[PDB]
Design a protein around this ligand. Structure first.
Ligand SMILES: Cc1cn([C@H]2C[C@H](O)[C@@H](COP(=O)(O)OP(=O)(O)O)O2)c(=O)[nH]c1=O
Ligand SMILES: [Zn+2]
Length: 418
């Protein structure tokens, strides 16, 4: 079972507004083998609360990290989207702060090591940290040195002793996936030199709220982060937020840069601008999160209505992709195998399995091309541009997509958008 949240991860306060509660829900990355019975399927409470002090949005509970990340499965290769995105992260980091060739770059949650490989091609020394022993060994086999550890003050000391001081410490997602964020911040304080940088990429709370991206809520994502809440945290551990760039990836993200409070790196104007923006858009006002909760109910309702309306007309519907967020969407909407006859997915592990809760079967794309599907529910909507670029034939035949946000809509639209 999962441990309930008491004090706030970032600022330490305990003043929680209730925003939305989806009740007990199965884990989004727990894909099941097909069976007659699913009675013993575990379910955990999924609900979010907003810290009135610093306005971090957090899940009400925390599912054991030994269950989640110690045996993660993860695709070798990746989207052309990701490959280019990884190369952009390198460019931003290296060029914006003039990191010389031969510099040392440490990555937390380094995974198979594709991101580190990009830094090596840019002429850098690297080292990975990832507690998934199965995946750490893969990266290690490929020639990308990776310590099978959790990041902490202790691991930071080990890195410094064996590999020296890093110019750049990188953490993607790992930041919104870790509960003890103080421990990470503390380990970073010890490890950074006077001019070193800590960079983290997470989904941006502003983007989430304005686009009603409620499906991005699942148990792996403990935190939903704005800049204000990070400043609040890093204040308490002798660190200063120095720069931020907004990114389109993952439905709207921010790449945040952090240095030592008394270090070389000057704070850019963008940091305070994004804090001024967060105030202006109502992140510190209860109304905004009641409005968000209302939008969820409206979208949930009309999206189920839309699906069942089409199925009543005899139109066949399926899912495109089987990402974690799809499993939130489908469970919250209460859709079954009677509603979506399958979900196509490129990941080989997932093919032949069944979705958590809904128990909708996952199939390969080559099977999907045999079927005469009328509508595809675009569960992997954050990869919309890549997917629509290659699905010309489907579109030409009269096929359509159902996009779930910012409001439910049908692609293609009835008229050309100028
Ligand atoms: C881009 C793309 C993704 N997918 C699927 C494969 C993965 O299971 C899933 C990717 O989502 P996932 O890796 O779960 O999270 P994120 O959306 O943050 O990457 O989408 C396809 O099936 N076809 C595609 O063309
Ligand atoms: Zn807080």
């Amino acid at each position: 079972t999962a441990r309930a949240v008491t004090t706030c991860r970032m600022c330490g306060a305990q003043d929680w507004q209730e925003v939305v509660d989806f009740g007990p829900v199965p884990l989004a990355d727990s894909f099941l083998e097909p069976a007659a019975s699913y009675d013993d399927e575990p379910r955990y409470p999924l609900a979010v609360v907003s810290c009135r002090s610093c306005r971090l949005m957090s899940l009400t509970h925390v599912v054991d990290p030994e269950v989640l990340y110690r045996t993660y499965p993860y695709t070798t290769s990746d989207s052309e989207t990701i490959k280019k995105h990884m190369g952009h992260v390198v460019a931003v980091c290296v060029e914006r702060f003039g990191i010389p060739e031969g510099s040392f770059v440490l990555e937390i949650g380094s995974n198979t090591g594709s991101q580190l490989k990009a830094f090596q091609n840019a002429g850098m020394r690297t080292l990975g940290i990832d507690p998934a022993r199965n995946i750490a060994a893969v990266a290690n086999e490929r020639g990308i040195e990776t310590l099978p550890e959790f990041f902490s003050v202790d691991t930071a000391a080990l890195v410094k002793k064996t590999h020296g001081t890093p110019q750049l410490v990188l953490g993607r997602h790992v930041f919104a996936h870790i509960d003890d964020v103080s421990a990470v911040a503390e380990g970073v304080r010890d490890l950074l030199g006077p001019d070193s940088l800590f960079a983290i990429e997470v989904p941006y709370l502003v983007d989430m709220l304005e686009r009603n991206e409620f499906d991005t809520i699942y148990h792996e994502h403990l935190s939903y982060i704005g800049v204000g809440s990070l400043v609040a945290l890093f204040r308490r551990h002798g660190l200063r937020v120095v720069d931020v760039e907004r990114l389109a990836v993952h439905g709207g993200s921010i790449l945040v840069f952090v240095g030592l409070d008394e270090g070389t790196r000057a704070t850019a104007p963008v940091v305070e601008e994004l804090i001024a923006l967060e105030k202006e858009r109502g992140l510190y006002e209860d109304a905004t999160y009641e409005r968000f909760a209302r939008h969820v109910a409206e979208i949930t309702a009309e999206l189920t209505s839309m699906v069942r309306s089409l199925r009543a007309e005899g139109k066949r519907i399926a899912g495109y992709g089987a990402p974690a967020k799809g499993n939130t969407l489908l469970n919250v909407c209460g859709l079954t195998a009677d509603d979506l006859e399958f979900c196509c997915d490129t990941t080989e592990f997932k093919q032949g399995l069944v979705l958590p809760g809904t128990h909708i079967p996952v199939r390969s794309p080559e099977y999907a091309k045999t079927q005469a599907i009328d509508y595809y529910l675009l569960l992997a909507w954050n990869y919309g541009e890549e997917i629509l670029a290659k699905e010309g034939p489907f579109l030409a035949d009269g096929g359509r997509f159902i996009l779930p946000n910012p409001r439910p809509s049908i692609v293609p639209p009835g008229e050309h958008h100028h």
